Amino acid sequence: RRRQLIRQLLERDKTPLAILFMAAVVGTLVGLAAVAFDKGVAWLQNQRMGALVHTADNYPLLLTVAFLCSAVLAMFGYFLVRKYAPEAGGSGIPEIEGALEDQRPVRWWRVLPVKFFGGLGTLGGGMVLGREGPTVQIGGNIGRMVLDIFRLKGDEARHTLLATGAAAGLAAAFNAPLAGILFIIEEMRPCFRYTLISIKAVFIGVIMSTIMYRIFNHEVALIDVGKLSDAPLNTLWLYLILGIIFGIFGPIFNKWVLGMQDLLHRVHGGNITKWVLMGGAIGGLCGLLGFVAPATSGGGFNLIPIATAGNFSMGMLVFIFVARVITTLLCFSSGAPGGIFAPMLALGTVLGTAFGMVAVELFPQYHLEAGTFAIAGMGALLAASIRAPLTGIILVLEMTDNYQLILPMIITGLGATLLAQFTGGKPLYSAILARTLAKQEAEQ
Amino acid sequence: RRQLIRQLLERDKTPLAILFMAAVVGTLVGLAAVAFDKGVAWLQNQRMGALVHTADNYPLLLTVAFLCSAVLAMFGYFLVRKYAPEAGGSGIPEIEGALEDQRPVRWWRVLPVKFFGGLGTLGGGMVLGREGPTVQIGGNIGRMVLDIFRLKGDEARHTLLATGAAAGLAAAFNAPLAGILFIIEEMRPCFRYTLISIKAVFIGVIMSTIMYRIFNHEVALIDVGKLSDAPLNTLWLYLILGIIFGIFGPIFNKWVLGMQDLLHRVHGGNITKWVLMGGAIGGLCGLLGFVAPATSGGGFNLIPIATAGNFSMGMLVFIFVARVITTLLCFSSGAPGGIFAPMLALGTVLGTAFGMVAVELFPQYHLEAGTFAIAGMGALLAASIRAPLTGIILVLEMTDNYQLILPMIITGLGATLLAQFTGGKPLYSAILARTLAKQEA
C-alpha cells in the first residue's frame, strides 16, 4: 500500500504523447463541427424570417408559413433520428455518460450525420432546445471516430478521447473553456469508479475547439449583461432563500420531464409515422409562437439580457415562465434531438429576476437590483435538476463576467442542490441513463 | 449493469450529518484563518514601529531589523522541532498523505504549532505564503471536529478532512472556487477513488469565505484593474511563455529538494543548530525587507507594481534572482509556511519580463506587458505543482481579467506539457514521496 503509493505519486501527471497529440485533433474537429452546426442553425432561422417577409400581408397565411416551415424541418429531424440513430434522441449527454461506463455503444458512423443534420432541423425550426445536447454527443463521437480511424489501444485512450470531445463540445457551445472541463470532472467522470481520463488531455481538446470557435465567432458575446452592482454581506440570506425555492422546484421539474416522456410515448407508441407527425406538430407550434410571442419559443439566449436589465413587467415574467416551462417539456420530453441545458438557463434567469423584483420593493434599505438575482438564478436550475452546481456557476460566470457576484452565485446554487437532495430529486442526466438501462433489461 | 443503475440513482446523496458538520468546519477554519491573518499583520506592524524608534542610527536600525526577524523566526522553528515536526515546510504534502491514510493528523499538536509557529515566520517578514499554514490548520480543524463529535466512517474521515483543507485555501486568497478545484485536482487521492463528497466541500468553503469577508471586506489582496484584451494573432506568444515556464518548472523543483538536503547537513537534525540557522535566515529577511523590500516578504505587494510595468528591465531580473534565492532559503529550510504564494510573485515577475521583450519586438500587436504578467502568474504553479486548472482559476479569481482566459490557459498548459517532457514531478507529490520513502529507509 505504501510502496505502491510512492510508485504512484512519482508517476502522476504522465500522459502518453500519443494521447495528447490526438486530444488536439479531436478538439480541432469538434470546434469546426460546432461552428458549422452553429452557422447552419442561424442560416435556417434566417430563411424562415425571409419567408415571413414574402408573406407579411396576409395574417393567417403568415401564421401558416410559420407553422409549416417549422413542422417540415422538425419532421425532417425526428425522421432522421427514428430511421437511422435512435440513441441520438433528446440530449445525448446521458448516452455519452453510459459510453464512459462502457454500457452504451458509440455508433459514430450513424450519429454524426443524424445528430448534426437532425439538430439543424429542430433547432433551425425555432424549437426550445439547446446546442449542448447536439455538440456534446457529436463531440464524443468525433473522439471515438479518431480512436477508431487511428486504431488507438487502451482503456485510457478510449475514455480520455471520448471525454475531451464531450468537453470541447460543451466548450464550443458557450465559448466556455472552463465550464467544459469542469462539467466532465463533476458530472461525467464515472461517479463511483476511478477512471483513466487524463485531465491535461481534456484541456488541450477544449483549447483547440475554443480557438476554433473564436476564429469564426469573434467580436460578439452570446450574452451581454454589462457590469452589474455588487452584493453586500447583509443581503446574502436573500440568495439562500432563492436557492431553497429552486431546491423544491428542481426535482419537480425533473418529475415533469420524465412523466412527459411517458405521456408523449403513448401518443405514438413507438410508431415512426405518428412520431414524426407529432414531432412536426410541436415543431410547427414553435415557429408559430416564435412570431406571436417570441419569448415563449426559441433557444432563450435572447431574453436573458432583456430580463436582467429589468425590462419585463411582473405579469410578463410569470407568463414567460409558465409558457416556457410548457414549451421546454414538449420539445425535450418528445425525444427531439437537442439539449435541455440552455433552456434551463433561460428559466432560471426569468425565475431569478422575478424574485429580484419582489425583493427590490420589499427591501429599499438594501438598494437591490433584480439583475443580480437573475444572474444568481441563471445557473440555479442547473444545480437543482442536473445537480452540477460547480459547472453551472462557472458557466454563468464565464458568460456574464460578474465575478463580484461569486458569493450569491455559489450560495443560491448550493441552496438549490441541498433542497433538491432533501426533497428526493435525482440528477436528471443520471436518471435518464438509468431509465434507458433499466428498460434495456426490462425486455430480457 | 444492475449495480450501475443502483449507483446512478444513489449519486449525490450525502448524509445530513456530514453536511451540517462541513458547515462548522469551514466556520472554524475561516475564523482561524482570519485570526492568523490579523496576527501576521499585527507583528509586521510592530517591526515597523521599532524601525521608527531607531530611524536615526543606520547600523542600529539594520540591527533591530535582523534581530526582530531572527527572534520571531527562532520562536517558530523551535515550536516546530520541539512539538510537531510534521508541521515543517508547507504541510499540504502532509494533508495529501492523511487522505491516503498514510500520515497521522495530530491536531492536539499541530494547531498551536503551525498557528503560533507561522505567526513567527510570516510576521518576521520571511518569503512564505499563508496557504501552507491555513490548509494544514484547516485539515486538522476538520479532524478535530471528527474526533470531538465522534463521527464514524471512511466518508466522514476523508470528507471533513478535505473541506477543511479547501476552506483553508479559500480563506487564504478570498478564492472560493480555487479552494474547491484544488482539492478535486491535486488532493483527491490521485490513483484510487474516494468518498470525498463535492457538495460537502462546497459548504465548508462558503462558510470560511463568508468568515473572511466579514473581517476583510472592501479591500482586495491584489488590484490590477481591467487590462487590455488579447488578439488571436498574439496567442502563439503565450504558448512560448508556457514553454519557458515548462523547462524552468522542474528545475525549480530540483533546487527546492536539493536545498532541503544542503540545509539539513548544516544542522544534522540538531534542534540547536536548526533554530539558530532558522533565525539567521529569518533575520536576513527582515534586513532585506528594508534595504530592498521586493526581495523579501510574501510577494503580493510587488504584483500590482509589476503588472503596471513600473519596474525597469534590470530591476525585474534582479528581483527574480534574489527572490529565487530567498524563496528557497525559507521553504527548503523546513520553516512553517507555504511556497504557493511566493510562486505567484515569481511567475508574475517572469511574465512581465517576457512581456517587456514582447512589447518592443512587436509594435504591430499593440501589446501590454501586464497581460503576460497575469499569464505568467499561475504558470509556475502549473509547472512546479502541476495543478494548472487550480492555478488558472486562482489568478482569475484574484485578478478578474476573464478576457485573458485563453492566454492564461494556453500559457498554463504550455507549462504543464514541457514540465512533463523534461521529467519534472508534481512538487507536493514528490515531497510526500520523499517523506514516505525516508520513513521506510
Partner: antibody, heavy 120, light 107 residues
C-alpha cells in the same frame, strides 16, 4: 459614437498649433487613439497612436518634437501639438479610433477632420 | 515601412460591370483593410482582414488575395459606389496606406 476634432485654421510657418478631438458615445478609456492626415487632393498618412494609459506613444518617422500626442481621459479628448510647421503640414487631420479583427489593427471609426493651413 | 501601390489610379465603369482594383505591396503583407472615401466625406472602414465586410456594407463587395497582391471586387457595381478606395496594412510597422483608386461611373 462620434469623433469631433477641432482647433485647426491658420498658422504661421515655423509656428505651432494644438488640435483637439472630442470623443463621445463609447468608453474612451479603452481604445488606442490615432491621427492620420490628408493633404489637399492627396492620400492618407498615419501620424501617431496612443494607448489608454498614455504609456505607449508611437509616431511616424519624424524629427524631435515635430509631433506630440497626448490624451485626457477625464475630458474624453485626444490632443495633437505640431511644432515648427512647414507647408508639408498643410493638410486635413483625421482623428481615428483604433481596433482589430484577428489582431491586425485597423482604423475603426474616423472623425470629420479639421483643416490646417500653413500660410502667411 | 511597406509601400502599397494601387493598380488603377483612376477607373471608369458602367453599373452592372464586375469591378476589381488591386493593392500590391513591396514586402509581404497579411490581412489588409480597405477604406471607402466618397466625395467631401471621411474615410469609412469598408473591408477588413482581407475579406470581411464591415456591418452595413452591401454583399456586392468582396476582398481577397495574399502575399504581395490583394484585391477589392465589386460584383455588379452600382452608381452609389463612386468613391476613392484606399488599402491599408498593419501586419508590419508602421502601418501604411495605398495611393487610392478613384472609381468613376459611366452613365
Amino acid at each position: 459614437v462620434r469623433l469631433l476634432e477641432s482647433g485647426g485654421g491658420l498658422v504661421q510657418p515655423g509656428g505651432s498649433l494644438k488640435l483637439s478631438c472630442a470623443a463621445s458615445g463609447f468608453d474612451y478609456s479603452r481604445y488606442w487613439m490615432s491621427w492620420v492626415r490628408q493633404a489637399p487632393g492627396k492620400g492618407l498618412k498615419w501620424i501617431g497612436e496612443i494607448n489608454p494609459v498614455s504609456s505607449t506613444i508611437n509616431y511616424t518617422p519624424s524629427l524631435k518634437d515635430k509631433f506630440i500626442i497626448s490624451r485626457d481621459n477625464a475630458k474624453d479628448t485626444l490632443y495633437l501639438q505640431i511644432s515648427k510647421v512647414r507647408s508639408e503640414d498643410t493638410a486635413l487631420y483625421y482623428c481615428a479610433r483604433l481596433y482589430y479583427g484577428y489582431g491586425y489593427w485597423y482604423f475603426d471609426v474616423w472623425g470629420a477632420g479639421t483643416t490646417v493651413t500653413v500660410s502667411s | 515601412d511597406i509601400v502599397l501601390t494601387q493598380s488603377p489610379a483612376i477607373m471608369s465603369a458602367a453599373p452592372g460591370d464586375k469591378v476589381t482594383m488591386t493593392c500590391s505591396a513591396s514586402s509581404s503583407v497579411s490581412y489588409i483593410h480597405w477604406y471607402q472615401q466618397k466625395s467631401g466625406t471621411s474615410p469609412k472602414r469598408w473591408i477588413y482582414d482581407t475579406s470581411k465586410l464591415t456591418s452595413g456594407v452591401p454583399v456586392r463587395f468582396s476582398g481577397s488575395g495574399s502575399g504581395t497582391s490583394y484585391s477589392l471586387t465589386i460584383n455588379t457595381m452600382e452608381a452609389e459606389d463612386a468613391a476613392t478606395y484606399y488599402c491599408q496594412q498593419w501586419s508590419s510597422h508602421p502601418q501604411t496606406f495605398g495611393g487610392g483608386t478613384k472609381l468613376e461611373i459611366l452613365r
